[PDB]
Amino acid sequence: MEIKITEVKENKLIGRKEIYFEIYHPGEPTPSRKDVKGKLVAMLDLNPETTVIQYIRSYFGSYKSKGYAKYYYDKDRMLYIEPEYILIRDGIIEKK
Amino acid sequence: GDPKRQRKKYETPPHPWIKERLDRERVLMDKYELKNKKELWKHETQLKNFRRRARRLLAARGKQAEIEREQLLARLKRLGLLPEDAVLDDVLSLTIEDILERRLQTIVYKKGLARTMRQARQLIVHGHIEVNGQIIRSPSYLVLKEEEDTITYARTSPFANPQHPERMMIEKA
Amino acid sequence: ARKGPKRHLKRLAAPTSWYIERKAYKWAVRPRPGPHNMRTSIPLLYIVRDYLGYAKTAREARKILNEGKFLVDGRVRKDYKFPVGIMDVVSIPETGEHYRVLPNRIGKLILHPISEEEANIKPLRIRNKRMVKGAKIQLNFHDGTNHLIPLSEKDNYFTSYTVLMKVPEREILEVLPFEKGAYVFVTQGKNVARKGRIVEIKKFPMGWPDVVTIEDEEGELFDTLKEYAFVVGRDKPRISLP
RNA sequence: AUUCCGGUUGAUCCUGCCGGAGGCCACUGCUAUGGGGGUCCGACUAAGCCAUGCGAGUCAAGGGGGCGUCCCUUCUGGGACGCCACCGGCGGACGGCUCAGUAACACGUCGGUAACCUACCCUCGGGAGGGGGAUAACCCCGGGAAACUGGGGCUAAUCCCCCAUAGGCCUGGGGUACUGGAAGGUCCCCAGGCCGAAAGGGAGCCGUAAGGCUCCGCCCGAGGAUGGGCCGGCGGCCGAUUAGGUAGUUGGUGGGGUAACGGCCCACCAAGCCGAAGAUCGGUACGGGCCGUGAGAGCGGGAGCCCGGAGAUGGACACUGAGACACGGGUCCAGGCCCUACGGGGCGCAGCAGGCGCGAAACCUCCGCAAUGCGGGAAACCGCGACGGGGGGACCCCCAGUGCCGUGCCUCUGGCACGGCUUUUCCGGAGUGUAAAAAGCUCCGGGAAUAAGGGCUGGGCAAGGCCGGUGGCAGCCGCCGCGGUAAUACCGGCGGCCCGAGUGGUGGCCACUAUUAUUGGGCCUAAAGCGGCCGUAGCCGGGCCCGUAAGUCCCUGGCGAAAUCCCACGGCUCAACCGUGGG
Ligand SMILES: [Mg+2]
Ligand SMILES: [Mg+2]
Ligand SMILES: [Mg+2]
Ligand SMILES: [Mg+2]
Ligand SMILES: [Mg+2]
Ligand SMILES: [Mg+2]
Ligand SMILES: [Mg+2]
Ligand SMILES: [Mg+2]
Ligand SMILES: [Mg+2]
Ligand SMILES: [Mg+2]
Ligand SMILES: [Mg+2]
Ligand SMILES: [Mg+2]
Ligand SMILES: [Mg+2]
Ligand SMILES: [Mg+2]
Ligand SMILES: [Mg+2]
Ligand SMILES: [Mg+2]
Ligand SMILES: [Mg+2]
Ligand SMILES: [Mg+2]
Ligand SMILES: [Mg+2]
Ligand SMILES: [Mg+2]
Ligand SMILES: [Mg+2]
Ligand SMILES: [Mg+2]
């Protein structure tokens, strides 16, 4: 798969950066969250502990998928802002 | 009052059993390999609408009329139904066969990707045809002129290999 | 409203000057009473979330507001129902950006970027003027705010004049009279967002509103209501306009 | 598509009605593979009756208590932390449901209030001084079958009550500062009265302490905003086998009452007010944006989504509050029903599911506060059958499937025999998706494998002059008409035609229809000119000159919400659907 970054935006008020990307992958299944997170942290030198993947979406007859993710500069800020369910779904914290 | 109710996009014949109309429509259905009459009727309605827009704009004047007139001409020649130097009058000479030539099934057949109309329909439905890098599975989709030449086998299809037994039979024609 | 005031607002019945998607959801934010009226203002939540896009959901928009990140006319606003209206100034000091709220060419509210220096002044149209106890003069402006002046300067202020006020200190620094040759900006009606110079004024009997004629840069003449004409300068605008 | 075709005669031309052929809505027979989108599903008869669960809470940063765990010392205690109820504040008048009543200022539209109220919110100008009191919680004793409820003791507050000042209201006499088109309005000065505020409270730091410095708060005045009250002109059903109606009725004068004007209600004085241009009375109905049909002019409907009105088993009437004569608050009558230990005590789903009844006629006693919003809170947050997500259903619209190719044979459309191919759909897995799931989307393995019916077959009107039964019997038949032993028309077989996941039956509206005629019909013989004439209202009215500008035409300001309709471009694979612009 090939990852292409479309746009990176800075949000000082929240204290995070928002990343939009595309994944090109003909003849392959939709990439898993773990692989995409590893590829992204390798590509931009990000701490994997404070990186969340909001979504990965596939389309009808396309060879590519669209993804949106967020990166926080502080772990406490990430815990205070993000909803609980998205942290569980991305494996950052453990469900009770 | 009453809220909106979604309406049919096609019109049925005023009388179901007229010999001449039955013969003409049967010829068309056989030639272009359509599934049922309603599909054919759908395209007919499209044609009529275009004509009804041309008739109304000929007898009009003002500022909005010119805008709508140029928009109609631009839309018609974007679909590939009119040459680049056509005028409004030329709208009134379109026929039903002109629209049927723009179906994706017909264009796939004419380009030589298939040996028969039915084979073209099967190829479209099973997902072997890509249009401008996108897979479309509707045989009745109307192809724009700007994208006509970028129509090929899907890059993941078995047919995207010149050694495939079925493709070699297609090329034999 | 069988027994009392309404508290809700459907999306389909929202004011027509907002930039909002009317079929995406069922409800909309009912604005709180405040400075402007319904037809010329929008709740702050839509500015934070939909216009600037600093937040995705309403919950995280409220967390931003409660931290005092937004200034309206130089004052911190925490209520997400607060109405923001014509000629207001929206400042984000942490990002250092400033906007002025203005009507569009079709009557919708938009944010126009402005310089930091211009962000300290706000124009106010004198909407009414009255006597108050102790023999003082009270001026009532178009956004509902009030000011007091002594009896000595009663002849320097009349209705439809414009006062340039320094915010948030609320200190007067300029008065722009309403007369022939003044520069005006239209706020409502068919000719909204057009600007020009005053040529003529007409009056009618029995309480019908009066009409003014305006010449634009290209030299065309058009009429509008006097109360829809907002004075912004002597012969050139004193503030940035789109 | 601005349309015709069958029927009165032995044969013909007319008038005239009936039937066929089209669209949409409700019920229904037979039969059904898939996905997507949307404002669909106990409205028509019963606004009939309802078992059970849920549909409105929130605040520990307003106040005293109870209980638990720890730290300091602890006889005793003081802290910190966490739960619980109670007093107290705000909300519960919105949201949700249904269309019984209503022919009316109910609704649509343009205006008015100088004749009015408004808690929460915004700006400016000021204020927060001095006293008093009870009670819940808690302890002791209880009563009652229960619903409920008594006595004594003790305590706090942003709880309640006083005094002062500010302030508010009424009337009389002056002065002319403001807005406005116009002052019973606002401002200033005297005078007589009546009414009459507040919580410097709470939280955190720096403070050794003193005291600051922030955060949330309390009261008065002027204006705004939000939500309403009230008033006017104009506009939109049927009946004369309903012709006179009204007596607080119509107006005046003097008062009361109201937040406020008003016969809204009284006392007194007059005889007015409405009506053949349809009063009064009766019938039927919630109004509009809109929806169905038609070339248009028109004709018909107004359940579902938005805006306005009204109601909570029927009929009356009050308490609290900024706002109610209050759907999940109170009282009486009427009529049903339930529990009692027989003395008493309770209840009306036209909220979400669910049950009975009535009928031709309508679904799960499910999951979630993740999104959109509302109430509460300083905030993090909590609650919400609103709203969001699924379950059942031939509700509406859009896009597909039930194979394709090559060579032979046949009756050559179509079927059969060989060889090859694909996997939309089907079966089993991985990822993504989702609050969690399910669908959906991308991949992998198997395999033509898992998938066609309903009506019609004499003419109108496309399709058989074939075979077997029945014999004016049985049956068909929208209409015209078939059947009496040689039936192309009934029953069945074999063929054929139309549409196709659909296709037929019954009822309603529009078109057909120039059979309602303004566009645009008729009245000698076919339905239809009063037996004749005179005349009131109404309608239609000769030629020229001067004036006006009501009708009429042109230009330009302020309006007629959004949704719905048409066009181009853009986003979901295209579309249906949704967004940005122009109409
Ligand atoms: Mg209705
Ligand atoms: Mg005859
Ligand atoms: Mg019922
Ligand atoms: Mg209510
Ligand atoms: Mg009724
Ligand atoms: Mg007092
Ligand atoms: Mg009606
Ligand atoms: Mg309904
Ligand atoms: Mg039910
Ligand atoms: Mg039904
Ligand atoms: Mg037969
Ligand atoms: Mg025939
Ligand atoms: Mg007829
Ligand atoms: Mg006739
Ligand atoms: Mg006669
Ligand atoms: Mg006669
Ligand atoms: Mg004449
Ligand atoms: Mg005139
Ligand atoms: Mg509109
Ligand atoms: Mg696309
Ligand atoms: Mg498109
Ligand atoms: Mg839209």
- Nearest chain C residue (CA) to A12: C95
Same domain for C87 and C201?
A: no
C-beta of residue B73 within 8 angstroms of C-beta of residue B86: yes
Experimental technique: cryo-EM
CA of B14 to the centre of ligand 10 (A): 30
Instruction: Mark whether C6 and C93 lie in a shared domain.
Output: yes
| Chain B residues whose beta carbon lies within 8 Å of the beta carbon of residue A29 | none
- List, as own/partner pairs, every contact residues C88-97 make where C-beta atoms lie below 8 angstroms and the sequence separation is at least 24, other chains included: C88/C35, C88/C122, C88/C143, C89/C114, C89/C119, C89/C122, C89/C167, C90/C47, C91/C119, C92/A13, C94/A12, C94/A13, C94/C69, C95/A12, C95/A13
Task: Give the chain A residue whose CA is nearest to the CA of C95.
Answer: A12
- Name A4's Cβ contacts closer than 8 Å, sequence gap at least 6: A21, A22, A23, A24
Q: Nearest residue of A to residue B132 by CA position? A: A62
Inter-residue contact C231 to C187 (CB < 8 Å) = no
Q: What span, in angstroms and rounded, lies between the C-alpha atoms of C150 and C168?
A: 21
Which residues in chain A are closer than 8 Å to C95, comparing Cβ atoms? 12-13
Where does a domain end: C134, C150, C178? C178
What range does the domain containing C185 cover?
A: 179-242
Nucleotide nearest to C34 (CA to C1'): D122
Tell me which amino acid residue B15 is.
Answer: H
Q: Both C125 and C188 in a single domain?
A: no
Q: Say whether both C89 and C186 belong to one domain.
A: no
- In Å, what is the separation between the CA of B15 and the C1' of D517? 28
Identify which of C164, C126, C120, C173 has the alpha carbon closest to the alpha carbon of residue C145: C126
CA distances from C74 to B43, C91, C122, C166 (A): 62, 7, 10, 10
The CB density around residue A94, as the number of other CB atoms within 10 Å, is 7
**Nucleotide at minimal C1' distance from the B65 CA:** D583
Query: What's the domain count of chain C?
Result: 3
Q: How many CB pairs under 8 A join A and C?
A: 15
Torsion of CA C58, C61, C62, C66, to 10 degrees: 180
Q: Max alpha carbon distance in chain B (Å)?
A: 65
Q: Are residues C7 and C95 in the same domain?
A: yes
Nearest to C74 by CA among C141, C169, C214: C169
- Provide, in whole angstroms, the distance separating residue B8's CA from nucleotide D396's C1': 10
φ and ψ of B88, to 5 deg: -65, -40
- Strand D interface, B 112-131, C-beta < 7 A: 115-116, 118-119, 121-122, 125-128
Which resolution in angstroms does this entry have? 2.6
Q: How far apart are CA C173 and CA B90, in angstroms?
A: 68
Test the B interface: residue of A28, A60, A63 with most B CBs within 10 Å: A63
Q: Which of residues 169-228 of C touch strand D (CB under 7 A)?
A: 170, 188-191, 203, 205-207, 210-211, 222-225, 228
Query: Between the CA of B12 and the C1' of D463, what is the distance in angstroms?
Result: 21
Q: Which of B136, B94, B129, B109 is nearest to B31 (CA)?
A: B109
List of chain A residues whose C-beta atoms are within 8 Å of the C-beta of residue C63: 81
Question: CA B24, CA B21: separation in Å to the nearest integer?
Answer: 5
Phi, psi dihedral angles at B103 (to 5 degrees): -65, 145
**Short-list A45, A39, A56, CA closest to A17:** A45
Cis peptide before C168 (omega within 30 of 0): yes
> Are B131 and B157 a contacting pair, CB within 8 Å?
no
**Residue B98: C-alpha distances to residues B47, B82, C141 (Å):** 9, 10, 66
What percent of the residues of chain B are helix, what percent strand, and what percent coil, each to the nearest 5? 50, 5, 40
Residues C112 and C2 in one domain: yes
Whether residue C143 sits in one domain with residue C65:
no
Closest CA to A67 of A83, A52, A54: A54
- Same domain? C206 vs C230: yes
Structure tokens at C155: 């002849």
A12 neighbourhood in chain C, CB within 8 Å: 94-95
Q: Does A59 touch chain B (CB under 8 A)?
A: no
